[PDB]
Amino acid sequence: IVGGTNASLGEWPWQVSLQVKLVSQTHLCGGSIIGRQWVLTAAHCFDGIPYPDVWRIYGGILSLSEITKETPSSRIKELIIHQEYKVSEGNYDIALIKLQTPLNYTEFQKPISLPSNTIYTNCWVTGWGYTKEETQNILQKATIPLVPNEECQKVINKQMICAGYKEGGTDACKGDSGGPLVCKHSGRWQLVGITSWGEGCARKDQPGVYTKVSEYMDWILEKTQ
Amino acid sequence: IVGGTNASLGEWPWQVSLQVKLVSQTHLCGGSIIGRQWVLTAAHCFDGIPYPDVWRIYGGILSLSEITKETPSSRIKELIIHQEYKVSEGNYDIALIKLQTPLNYTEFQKPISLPSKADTNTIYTNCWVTGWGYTKEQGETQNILQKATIPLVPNEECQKKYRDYVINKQMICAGYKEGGTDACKGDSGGPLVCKHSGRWQLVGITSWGEGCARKDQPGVYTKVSEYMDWILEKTQ
Numbered sequence A: 001i002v003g004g005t006n007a008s009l010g011e012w013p014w015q016v017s018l019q020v021k022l023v024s025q026t027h028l029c030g031g032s033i034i035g036r037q038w039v040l041t042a043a044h045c046f047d048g049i050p051y052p053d054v055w056r057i058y059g060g061i062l063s064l065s066e067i068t069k070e071t072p073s074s075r076i077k078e079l080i081i082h083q084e085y086k087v088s089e090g091n092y093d094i095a096l097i098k099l100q101t102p103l104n105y106t107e108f109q110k111p112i113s114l115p116s117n118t119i120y121t122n123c124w125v126t127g128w129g130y131t132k133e134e135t136q137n138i139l140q141k142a143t144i145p146l147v148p149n150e151e152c153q154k155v156i157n158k159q160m161i162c163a164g165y166k167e168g169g170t171d172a173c174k175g176d177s178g179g180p181l182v183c184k185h186s187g188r189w190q191l192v193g194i195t196s197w198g199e200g201c202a203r204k205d206q207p208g209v210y211t212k213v214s215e216y217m218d219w220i221l222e223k224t225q
Numbered sequence B: 001i002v003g004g005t006n007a008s009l010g011e012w013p014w015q016v017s018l019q020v021k022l023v024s025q026t027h028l029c030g031g032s033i034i035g036r037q038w039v040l041t042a043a044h045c046f047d048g049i050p051y052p053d054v055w056r057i058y059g060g061i062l063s064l065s066e067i068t069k070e071t072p073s074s075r076i077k078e079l080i081i082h083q084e085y086k087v088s089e090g091n092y093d094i095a096l097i098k099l100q101t102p103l104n105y106t107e108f109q110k111p112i113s114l115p116s117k118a119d120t121n122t123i124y125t126n127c128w129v130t131g132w133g134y135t136k137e138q139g140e141t142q143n144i145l146q147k148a149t150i151p152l153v154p155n156e157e158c159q160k161k162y163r164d165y166v167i168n169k170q171m172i173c174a175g176y177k178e179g180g181t182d183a184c185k186g187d188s189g190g191p192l193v194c195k196h197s198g199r200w201q202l203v204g205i206t207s208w209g210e211g212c213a214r215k216d217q218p219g220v221y222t223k224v225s226e227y228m229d230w231i232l233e234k235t236q
Ligand SMILES: *[C@H]1O[C@H](CO)[C@@H](O)[C@H](O)[C@@H]1O
Pocket: A005, A006, A007, A138
């Protein structure tokens, strides 16, 4: 995350860190709790490392230093990458992770509501990725305005969402992929976007791109059975 | 394709024809669309004409005759031949083409999925080669795209079959013991694909041999899954 302030604990209980830890761990990507045994994240996070048993998932934390031997992790029972996703492009950048053991929610770990079709205000982003360019131990926060896609074009499908100041200076960078773009409306927080890609980490006029969760609901419901 | 049959329109929408204008414009290789601006092919296709500006790339067609000099072709912005490939030699025989201009996906022009490193134990039972190559050992390029189905022949038995050359892990062998069904001259760089699940996957790229359907001498194919890191690296 870049352009943004440090994270209160409990403020974003749905945020998880996906880590691989082959022999030792490493935070590679973010994700969102959406169900007791379900995390939503970006397909491209698993390009280099599609091996599910190697991944480890941590929620309800703020400082990655808190993770230790006696820190319960979640495991991937099943990794469901969209079938149209292809490594060479940013289309269909979405993935469901079915957890091995269903979580028991707390003050610090709870799900996000999926979007059920409007004009969002108060949209936010989070993550453990650097500002500018290394990895931060403490989760981060920045507020951002949606950019209409048709303007976003400066190929961007109906399945994408864009956000960013075109003055620039706040966006997400590596390690923030698969993390959530959320919005606060009808009094309720919703998960509107999944961070996917943008050229650079936004500088000046480069809005970031996000998978648009609402247009993948059929998919998500289909795959959760 | 020796021992094949006509493809239908839209059947193999990732298949492209790689041509060059020497005399009349001429088909020299095949290739596979793997993204809007990415085409995967064989590196030995450029052995004699390693000048990118010269090549025209055509997709979404069944008959090469459909191609008039008024049909729009894609051009090569960037030719990425694998770092370790050497010209006469048969290893690392793979190349990425970055197109000058994004393609438009249609019914007849689609990309094909690549295999995942987590697919590498998969046993594929339903495999196909397609191309405009010769249909007999000494023959002519074919107007209508050919298809042929052909079984994978495991590494060790394929090595047995080729005493003089070395068949490494980066390759993959397909053919019948009797022979008679194979890729021929003009099919190089084209796709070997396999249906697994409900999904087509690019499993190989036609490479060497071009014995063109000799007895017990399976066509040899570049094993795509072996190059995922390379591809991921080059396509960013
Ligand atoms: C969050 O808090 C850390 C403490 O490590 C500071 O580096 C900085 O104030 C950031 O906003």
